[PDB]
Design a protein around this ligand. Structure first.
Ligand SMILES: Nc1ncnc2c1ncn2[C@@H]1O[C@H](COP(=O)(O)OP(=O)(O)O)[C@@H](O)[C@H]1O
Ligand SMILES: [Mg+2]
Ligand SMILES: [Zn+2]
Ligand SMILES: [Zn+2]
Lengths: 613, 627
DNA sequence: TTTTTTTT
């Protein structure tokens, strides 16, 4: 056959890079041949794929091998796999076989990782076709894993000659001429499913990131393909980097299974479609188990702010560092992010522990910046404007793809996390009702379109509206000062109503603060804690499970009685007591106390009292 | 020559199936399987499979139940072999079933030429997402909720054919249920050609497919639920209904189709499961029958039941009574007397009415819960879509003698109208006039006039429902957010205690957890309603019904004083029957009628609060509260 | 179904 002496040279260099790499940071520069050690671990677990750092092979042999493979990855891949099999035979001959009946050949997936750079979706070019690259972006769509037919096998339906180890092209391929020279069967190739080996496969769609080419352009999208262990390796709707080769997808319909090339196809033309074949995938976007996940210094820092007793106030201060004032509102953020203990009673009734906050401020109150910080600083956080939004896009949508199927809405896109709702006032009343039922149920059911599916839809909602007429009439009542269905009002945990004040001192302070925010830009802000530090502490608190206390039971019952008397009930109901308990849970989580404290209930009582105004 | 079971341990074959297909290997496997069936026994020593065969013949069932653990207990080698290559050993074990059944029931082939093996308790389990190509071609135990079901249509179990060229007859090839035959050749003349199916020789098996979707809870949070299709074959066809959670065990098969090929531009195969044994994941028993019969007593059994209604919800004892009566219901007397008890649960928002409705949902053997805004009147009634051309039923229709939980009170309104007037759903969709008998109880709830209840103006004025709608309710309930420091304190104590008891921190502890908030255990209660409705059929007391007549006449007189209807009398009778049922009384007693009178008189009192409430109270103090 | 000017 074709010598491809360069190919076999690359094979040899690749096996020598896999076995004689002789590099290891463990025990300082002491060489372990980390690829030989990875082969040893491979024997321990008997996987298929081999993780290969691009930088390792780059330092290997001056990176000439890295360059060659990175360009002609497609051409070199069979040689690389053959060399990997040779290495396995050398050191892990057991793994050389799949490893009872006969064990077939084991396929090894060379999933290179840690590439030098990531090229953006628009950076993609035909020049890179077949070259190993890495692409970043969020996963807009995915596919159910399905068994691509890697190696095919067919029984000759005229002589029974069985074929095997037939690689398939994009279109389902079949043997052309019977291997049995005596036989002359050119069709009738009953696929031997048992003999043939199928690899797992999954289509995945991604879109351009916001700060990628935002300049006057719609975010470009790419169809990457997951194979082998990579399948399902990443969750949907998350920014991740995919390393692999650029694959050109010919139209199978043209293959037969502007114009296109022809005269091969034969008379038929052929139109292509570029795509990407991911080899390795990396995402970039218990209390004791969480601590284990943390680094030693990270655990120390955790303990450090745990020891701090002002920690509560400093955290509240850290919230929305750019935003000035409205400290109670920042406290509301913190508490909602912490959430509350969700529980289902013995009777089974589910009791939500989440907190759905609502904000009613005049324009320019920076509520927009408020939500921007919230979502940006919040995982599982979705931001949307009520004025421009569709119910299905917000909760869930039904689409037909070969065939009726479903598409997650904002609630799904952020279920079990923050749900920012900007311009809520402008939001459609019917859509508001859809959310109402969905959030109250903590569940979304797609009854329509024939299908009757249902999804968890559990999450927290940060409603953001403006008072009717762009201004809150203090003479009027919250219910009436803003257009919104009262029952949904009942299930909004909080209502931060933002008013204007002519306090000259406050005006001067805020003006100076803004002007500094522009002068010194980032230098102006200085929260007590870093956002990553804040998130680590927050998750640690999430790990906590507050427990109610006898004194707390009492304090709660008297405080609820006092609230009922205060309204004496347009805004005071059993829902208010439920929110009181949830706020107590959130405060304890901020206090990182497994038990509730009447002080915590006092804080929550003051919070709700202020919300009442 | 045949081989030993230990010899079978040495697979010594290219594949597990390759080993199984070995002739002597097949003989050994069959012998061992028959040995297991006849020999393997419960610890009691009785041949569990012997009794299973006995029943199989008796019931004429064509599917034989099999427990995987039992074979794992003995002959586990065959368990592993089957797991690796389910199809082959399934066929062999089915023949073993032939032999085992015939010896105990000679000539059973007449009753069923064949039998189907039904493995059970398959240890390994995977979710739809868990499924992997490694899993393919092997048995898998999976769970989910059926999304859509197709009608049971016949399929060609066995097929002969006829070459158009000569084609007198072609072999009776067995259809695989996943692909066509496509012989693409003729034995009579060596070549291709149109191979007309031989209608003379062909076996037909019932065929069906139902889509299965991952359970919501099973879905990882944020993760998108996935669904796979599972083909159901004869016997297994039409076991469960769409929207029902189910677990199945079948071979994870697959096949080629250029459709997906072009769709994904890659050589990928569609994957499907051929169900071998289905399982849906309440019914009382003799122990519970006799236990209910004892506890059925005059000792405030009605009161105890009410106390166990919505125990998570404080007070509302009248509401608890109404919902209990609805759960048990009343005996219908067709000719067309309704037996259902339609109850509306009007209340101030956030008054837990939705929560008690959900409680009933959990506490209801069959019920339908829908949202007036989030539920479609079409989805309540029916819809038509291509299957092809087919219709589907509606939620109201889905409610068959089962309480129809609903709230948030258009097309839905007229659908209820037709429903309340007659418990059936007429429809002429696609120019096909027909009716769908729902015959089910209804439960309603809403906010008066979309705002805090108003004592002024009657209850009807406090709502917007048409008076017909109001009357056709067996009863109506009103809840008001009145403020009382003592009641508020009691409610707060109850709520905080509920949160504490429900807190995760707080199995054997369940007995202390229930805290006797419910006098009867909830499970026993659920079985109680089921057993009572199934068996208890109250008999009205004509002698007492005379006093009922004069009482209704008095109520009519007072309505003229300031509006009763025969519907009120029928509601009183129905709820008296329900009272009898709650205490497992097949004979209605005067006390049932007294409670019915009080309840219905109260439901009449809810009308016209500021107008007449006091006058009605004075008039009926003896009729409703006097005794 | 969802989005969508446009008229009714
Ligand atoms: N009697 C009661 N006992 C316990 N909780 C109650 C009671 N009445 C009202 N509640 C509380 O009110 C809250 C809201 O009730 P909900 O079912 O939403 O009423 P609605 O259906 O009117 O919205 C519930 O969480 C429930 O705990
Ligand atoms: Mg409710
Ligand atoms: Zn051949
Ligand atoms: Zn012929």
């Amino acid at each position: 056959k074709v010598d491809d002496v360069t190919g076999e040279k690359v094979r040899e260099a690749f096996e020598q890079f896999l076995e004689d790499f002789s590099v290891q940071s463990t025990d300082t520069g002491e060489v372990e041949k980390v690829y030989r050690a990875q082969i040893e671990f491979m024997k321990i677990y008997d996987l298929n794929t081999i993780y290969i750092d691009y930088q390792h092979l780059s330092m290997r042999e001056n990176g000439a091998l890295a360059m060659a493979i990175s360009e002609q990855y497609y051409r070199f891949l069979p040689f690389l796999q053959k060399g990997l099999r040779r290495v396995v035979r050398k050191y892990a001959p057991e793994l050389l076989n799949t490893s009872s009946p006969e064990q077939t050949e084991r396929v090894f997936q060379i999933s290179f990782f840690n590439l030098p750079t990531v090229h953006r979706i628009r950076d993609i070019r035909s020049e890179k076709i077949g070259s190993l690259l890495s692409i970043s972006g969020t996963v807009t769509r995915t596919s159910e894993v399905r068994p691509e037919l890697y190696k095919a096998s067919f029984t000759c339906d005229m002589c029974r000659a069985i074929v095997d180890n037939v690689e398939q092209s994009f279109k389902y391929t079949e043997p052309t001429f019977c291997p049995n020279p005596s036989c002359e069967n050119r069709a009738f190739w009953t696929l031997n499913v048992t003999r043939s080996r199928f690899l797992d496969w999954q289509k995945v769609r991604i879109q351009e990131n916001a700060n990628e080419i935002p300049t006057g352009s719609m975010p470009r999208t790419l169809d990457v393909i997951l194979r082998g262990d990579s399948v399902e390796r990443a969750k949907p709707g998350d920014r991740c980097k995919f390393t692999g080769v650029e694959i050109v997808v010919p139209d199978v319909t043209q293959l037969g299974l502007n114009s296109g090339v022809t005269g091969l196809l034969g008379v038929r033309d052929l139109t292509y479609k570029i795509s990407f074949l991911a080899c390795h995938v990396i995402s970039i976007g218990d209390q004791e188990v969480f601590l284990n996940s943390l680094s030693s210094d990270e655990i120390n820092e955790l303990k450090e702010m745990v020891k701090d007793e002002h920690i509560y106030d400093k955290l509240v201060r850290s919230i929305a560092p750019a935003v000035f004032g409205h400290e109670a509102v920042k406290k509301g953020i913190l508490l909602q992010m912490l959430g509350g203990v969700h529980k289902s009673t013995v009777e089974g009734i589910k009791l939500r522990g989440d907190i759905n906050i609502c904000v009613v401020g005049d324009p320019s109150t920076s509520k927009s910046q408020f939500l921007k910080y919230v979502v940006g600083f919040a995982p599982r956080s979705v931001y949307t404007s009520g004025k421009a939004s569709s119910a299905a896009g917000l909760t869930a949508a039904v689409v037909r793809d070969e065939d009726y199927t479903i598409e997650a809405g904002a609630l799904m896109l952020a279920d079990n996390g923050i749900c920012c709702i900007d311009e809520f006032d402008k939001m459609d009343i019917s859509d508001q009702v859809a959310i109402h039922e969905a959030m109250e149920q903590q569940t979304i059911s797609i009854a329509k379109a024939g299908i009757h599916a249902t999804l968890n839809a559990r999450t927290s909602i940060l409603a953001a509206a403006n008072p009717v007429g762009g201004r809150y009439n203090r003479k009027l009542s919250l219910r009436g000062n803003l257009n919104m269905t009262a029952p949904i009002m009942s299930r909004f945990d909080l209502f931060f109503v933002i008013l204007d004040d002519c306090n000259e001192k406050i005006d001067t302070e805020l003006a100076s603060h803004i002007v500094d925010l522009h002068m010194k830009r980032d230098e102006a802000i200085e929260p007590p804690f870093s956002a990553e530090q804040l998130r680590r502490y927050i998750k640690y608190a999430r790990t906590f499970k507050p427990i109610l206390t006898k004194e707390a039971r009492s304090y709660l019952v008297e405080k609820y009685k006092e609230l009922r008397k205060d309204d004496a009930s347009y805004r005071i109901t059993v829902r208010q007591l439920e929110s009181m308990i949830r706020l107590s849970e959130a405060i304890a989580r901020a206090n990182c106390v497994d038990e509730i404290t009447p002080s915590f209930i006092a804080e929550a009582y003051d919070l709700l009292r202020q919300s009442i105004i | 020559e045949e081989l030993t079971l230990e010899s079978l341990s040495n697979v010594k074959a290219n594949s597990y199936s390759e080993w199984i297909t070995q002739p002597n290997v097949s003989r050994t496997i069959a012998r061992e399987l028959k040995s297991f069936l006849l020999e393997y026994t419960d610890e009691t020593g009785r041949s569990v499979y012997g009794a299973r065969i006995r029943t199989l013949g008796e019931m004429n069932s064509e599917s034989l139940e099999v427990n995987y653990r039992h074979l794992a207990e003995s002959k586990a080698i065959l368990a592993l072999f089957l797991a690796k290559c389910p199809e082959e050993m399934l066929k062999i074990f089915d023949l073993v079933a032939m032999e085992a059944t015939e010896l105990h029931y000679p000539d059973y082939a007449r009753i069923h030429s064949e039998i189907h093996v039904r493995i059970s308790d398959f240890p390994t389990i995977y979710s739809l997402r868990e499924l992997r190509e490694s899993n393919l071609s092997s048995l898998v135990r999976v769970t989910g909720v059926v999304t859509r079901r197709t009608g049971v249509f016949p399929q060609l179990k066995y097929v002969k054919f006829n070459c158009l060229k000569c084609g007198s007859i072609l072999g009776p090839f067995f259809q695989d249920s996943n692909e066509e035959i496509r012989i693409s050749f003729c034995t009579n003349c060596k070549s291709k050609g149109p191979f007309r199916v031989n209608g003379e020789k062909t076996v037909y098996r019932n065929y069906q497919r139902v889509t299965l979707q991952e359970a919501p809870g099973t879905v990882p949070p944020g993760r998108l639920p996935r669904h796979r299709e599972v083909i159901l074959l004869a016997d297994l066809v039409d076991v469960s209904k769409p929207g029902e959670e189910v677990e199945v065990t079948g071979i994870y098969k697959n096949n080629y189709d250029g459709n997906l090929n072009a769709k994904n531009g890659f050589p990928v195969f569609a994957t499907i499961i051929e169900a071998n044994s289905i399982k849906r994941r309440f019914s009382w028993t003799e122990e519970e029958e006799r236990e209910f019969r004892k506890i059925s007593r005059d000792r405030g059994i009605i009161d105890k039941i009410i106390s166990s209604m919505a125990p998570s919800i404080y007070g509302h004892r009248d509401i608890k009574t109404a919902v209990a009566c609805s759960l048990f219901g009343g005996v219908p007397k067709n000719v067309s007397i309704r037996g259902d008890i339609n109850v509306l649960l009007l209340g101030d928002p956030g008054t837990a009415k939705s929560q008690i409705l959900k409680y009933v949902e959990k506490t209801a053997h069959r019920a339908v819960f829908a949202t007036g805004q989030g539920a479609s009147a079409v989805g309540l009634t029916a819809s038509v879509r291509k299957d092809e051309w087919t219709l589907e039923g509606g939620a109201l229709v889905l409610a068959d003698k089962g309480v129809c939980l609903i709230d948030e009170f258009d097309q839905d309104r007229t659908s209820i109208h037709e429903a309340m007037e007659q418990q059936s759903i007429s429809i002429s969709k696609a120019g096909i006039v027909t009716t769908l008998q729902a015959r089910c109880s209804i439960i309603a709830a809403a906010n008066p006039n979309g705002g805090r209840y108003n004592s002024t103006l009657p209850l009807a004025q406090n709502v917007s429902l048409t008076e017909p709608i109001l009357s056709r309710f067996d009863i109506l309930c009103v809840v008001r957010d009145l403020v009382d420091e003592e009641a508020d304190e009691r409610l707060a104590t109850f709520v905080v205690d509920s949160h504490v008891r429900s807190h995760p921190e707080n199995l054997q502890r369940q007995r202390k957890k229930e805290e006797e908030i419910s006098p009867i255990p909830q499970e026993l209660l659920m079985k109680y309603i089921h057993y009572a409705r199934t068996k208890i059929y109250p008999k009205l007391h004509q002698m007492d019904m005379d006093k009922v007549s004069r009482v209704y006449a008095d109520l009519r007189r007072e309505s003229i004083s300031t509006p009763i209807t025969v519907r009120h009398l029928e509601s009183i009778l129905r709820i008296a029957e329900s009272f009898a049922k709650m205490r497992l009384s097949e004979f209605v007693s005067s006390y049932d009628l007294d409670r019915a009178i009080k309840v219905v008189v109260d439901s009449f009192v809810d009308a016209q609060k500021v107008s007449v409430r006091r006058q009605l109270r004075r008039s009926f103090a003896i009729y409703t509260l006097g005794h």
